[PDB]
Each structure stands twice: as structure tokens, then as C-alpha cells.
Amino acid sequence: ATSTVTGGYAQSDAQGQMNKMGGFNLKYRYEEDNSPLGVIGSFTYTEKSRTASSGDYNKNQYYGITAGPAYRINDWASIYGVVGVGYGKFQTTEYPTYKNDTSDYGFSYGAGLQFNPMENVALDFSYEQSRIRSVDVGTWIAGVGYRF
């Protein structure tokens, strides 16, 4: 039950203050009075690691595909439902075929807590956490778009 372009910044500091950047969360949908089901597409990248020497950290980027229906309900309080899982062949790249091979399920999702607009602004509060073996990240979404 949305229809606007949102975005901001997501800071990351894991491994003991040794990471920066991340990407922008883009949300765009269109479902209202027609069918209690839409297509929530979220394509974002993860600015983590990098190979600027001889690949001694990690390779490939992160890919997440979130999805969920549209249910407003309540007097006028939307509900959260943005689940996501991470996976791929990336973790160790500095040997003749070593990799890690630690098939795990990532927990990517936020909560619903949107306030009413005052003049022309709609801030969203969604908490994102990771669980890659042992990584701690504390991002603070600062969306600054419209609301529909």
C-alpha cells in the first residue's frame, strides 16, 4: 500500500570499526484497491569488503530479494512484512579454491513504525541486522521521501 521513492544512507561498522558504506534502500510499489497482493521489489547493494591488491578479504557482492504482501488494516497503521535471506559463494578468496562453504540463513527485515506527515516528509523506522557468522551492524535508516 505504498507508492513513493525512498532512500538514504546505511552506515556499517563491523569487525571492530573496520567498515563503511553499504548502499541505499529503494522501495517502490503500487497496490491499492484492486487486489490484496502486490510485488515488493527491493534491489540494493552491499558496500562491504573489496579487492584492491590481490583479493585478500572477500569477493563478489551481496544480493538480497525481499518480498511481502500489502496489508494496511488497523485504523490507519500499516504492518511490516519485509523478509529477506542472504546467500552465495563469498567469504574466503585468497587460495587455490578454498571458499568457506557455510550455507547459512541471513535475517534481513525491518519493522513497521511510520508516523504522520506534518508538512511534506515521511520518515520510516526499520531496524536491519545481520548474522554472517559473527558480524554486528547497526544501521539507522533516514528515509526522506513522500508517502502514498
Elucidated via: NMR
Q: Is 28 left (phi over 0), alpha (psi -120 to 50) or beta?
A: beta
What is the distance between the alpha carbons of residues 30 and 3, in angstroms, rounded to a whole number?
5
Buried b (16+ CB within 10 A) or exposed e, 46-60: bbbbeeeeeeeebee
Q: Report which residue type is found at 107.
A: F
* β-sheet bridge partners, residue 109: 83
Please say whether the beta carbons of 108 and 128 come within 8 A.
yes
1-148 CATH, one of 3.30.1490.20, 2.40.160.20, 3.40.190.10, 3.40.50.800: 2.40.160.20
In Å, what is the CA distance from 67 to each residue of 40, 61, 98? 5, 20, 33
Residues in CB range of 75: below 8 A, 6 or more apart: none
Please say whether the beta carbons of 106 and 82 come within 8 A.
no
CA 83 to chain centre: 9
Q: SS3 sequence, the chain?
A: CCCCCCCCCCCCCCCCCCCCCCCCCCCECCCCCCCCCCCCECCCCCCCCCCCCCCCCCCCCCCECCECCCCCCCCCCCCCCCEECECCCCCCCCCCCCCCCCCCCCCEECCCCCCCCCCCCECCCCCCCCCCCCCCCCCCCCCCECCC
CB atoms within 10 A of CB 93: 19
Could you tell me the three cell numbers for 116? 504522520
| Nearest residue to 125 (alpha-carbon basis) of 135, 106, 139 | 139
In Å, what is the CA distance from 147 to each residue of 117, 139, 140? 8, 22, 19
What is the distance between the alpha carbons of residues 77 and 73, in angstroms, rounded to a whole number?
7
Indicate the Cα dihedral angle 10, 24, 110, 2, nearest 10°: 140
Q: For the chain, which residues make up each domain, given as ranges?
A: 1-148
